[PDB]
Structure 1
Amino acid sequence: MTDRYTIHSQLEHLQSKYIGTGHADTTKWEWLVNQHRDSYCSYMGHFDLLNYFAIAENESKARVRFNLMEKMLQPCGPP
């Protein structure tokens, strides 16, 4: 069964479908995990931050992209 969790959506006031915006009741974990995900897509987005990160290890660029890419699922830790 279930009880009373019927909340499909409501008045389309602004449609903040941009993920990562956040509202008043947004906790520390939520906007820090959006902060880490935006950081990761900007790391692999720019070529040259990915250069800078690949020089610091000896790892190749696809190794660094696969590491950064698999960390985007749960980067900060469990809620």
Structure 2
Amino acid sequence: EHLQSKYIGTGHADTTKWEWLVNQHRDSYCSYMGHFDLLNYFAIAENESKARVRFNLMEKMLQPCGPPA
């Protein structure tokens, strides 16, 4: 009720798997954008810099798994 409205990503008993997967992907993107080690590993894995990787992580926050079902 109020816990799902105050803190997003908690869930309830009628939560589907797609919303939980989208919340887990958003939490993983926030942990990658927050921690410097994950951003450095993502910048060393590809040829892009830290700003391009941060823009690609911020642009993928809107529906990271796809359309809902």
Q: Distance in 1 between matches of 2:15 and 2:4?
A: 17
Unmatched segments (≥5 aa) in structure 1:
1-11
Q: Percent identity?
A: 100
Q: With the length of structure 2 as denominator, give the TM-score of the two structures.
A: 0.91
Question: Relative contact order (C-alpha < 8 Å, sep 6+): which is higher?
Answer: 2
Residue deviations 1:15-56 (CA, integer Å, cap 9, x gap): 751100000000000000000000000001001100001100
Point out the structure with the larger helix share: 2
Equivalent residue for 2:49? 60
Q: Which portions of structure 1, spanning 4 or more consecutive aligned residues, are displaced by more than 6 angstroms?
A: none
Q: How many residues get paired?
A: 68
| Structure (1 or 2) with the larger CA radius of gyration | 1
Instruction: Name structure 2 gaps, 5 residues minimum.
Output: none
TM normalised by structure 1 equals 0.80
